[PDB]
Amino acid sequence: VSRNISNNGIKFTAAFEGFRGTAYRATPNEKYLTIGYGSYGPHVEPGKTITPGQGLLLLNRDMAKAVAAVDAVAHHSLTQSQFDAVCDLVYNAGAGVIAAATGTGKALRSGDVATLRAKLALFINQNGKPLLGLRRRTAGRLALFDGKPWQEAEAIGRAVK
């Protein structure tokens, strides 16, 4: 059976990406505009405005490749939540982190839930050093992995100091 990121997972990702209702250029060097939950590309038209509900639809569509990468190799005994949490990791940090040779990627493939969660807890670094935002998103990501509603996963993430 083919899997999809659940609504609880889309809303977890959405809470950490943050919503902007009006097209805007996030940095002056980027060729394209951004809108909604980090949606970026040729489709974003100057002066476009959208609602949060439209943002979730876009986000779900923008997460398509991450969902396919996780779905193609994750053990079918993962829960929906555990699958959701990996979908957020792969969307955030790229699909390299679940390559067949990594430790994350072999626990994912075998369904070693306990190891998978321990590996998930380590993605807090940028260029080899801890970053507070990645500790927050990871902490909440671990709460999502454990089955908690996105609202609680978010709060658990952001309460990390």
Side-chain angles (χ1 to χ4, degrees):
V1 76
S2 90
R3 287 164 296 193
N4 294 275
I5 181 176
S6 72
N7 201 233
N8 189 53
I10 302 164
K11 293 211 189 183
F12 173 87
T13 298
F16 278 91
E17 302 292 323
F19 174 75
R20 304 263 258 105
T22 290
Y24 68 101
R25 199 174 299 274
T27 61
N29 280 3
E30 271 164 24
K31 188 186 172 5
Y32 296 119
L33 300 191
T34 301
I35 199 152
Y37 290 105
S39 189
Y40 171 84
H43 61 279
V44 185
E45 165 186 53
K48 179 86 202 166
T49 58
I50 65 187
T51 68
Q54 292 173 311
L56 300 180
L57 195 66
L58 254 196
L59 179 55
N60 179 68
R61 166 65 175 87
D62 285 336
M63 289 187 89
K65 275 183 226 144
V67 168
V70 176
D71 193 26
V73 298
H75 195 259
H76 275 96
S77 74
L78 296 200
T79 65
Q80 183 62 57
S81 275
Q82 288 157 344
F83 173 87
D84 290 341
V86 176
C87 281
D88 182 68
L89 171 72
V90 169
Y91 188 67
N92 204 36
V97 310
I98 70 164
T102 68
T104 301
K106 308 167 68 80
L108 183 60
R109 289 167 162 77
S110 65
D112 183 4
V113 171
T115 314
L116 183 58
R117 181 186 198 293
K119 298 305 199 230
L120 192 53
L122 309 165
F123 292 92
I124 76 166
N125 312 289
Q126 166 166 66
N127 300 317
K129 283 326 150 203
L131 226 62
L132 179 60
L134 303 179
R135 292 172 60 230
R136 304 217 159 124
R137 211 204 267 223
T138 279
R141 204 175 275 146
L142 288 180
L144 179 71
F145 185 98
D146 287 342
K148 303 217 156 65
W150 70 262
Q151 295 96 329
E152 184 164 19
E154 183 186 6
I156 288 167
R158 292 186 193 297
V160 166
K161 164 46 215 81

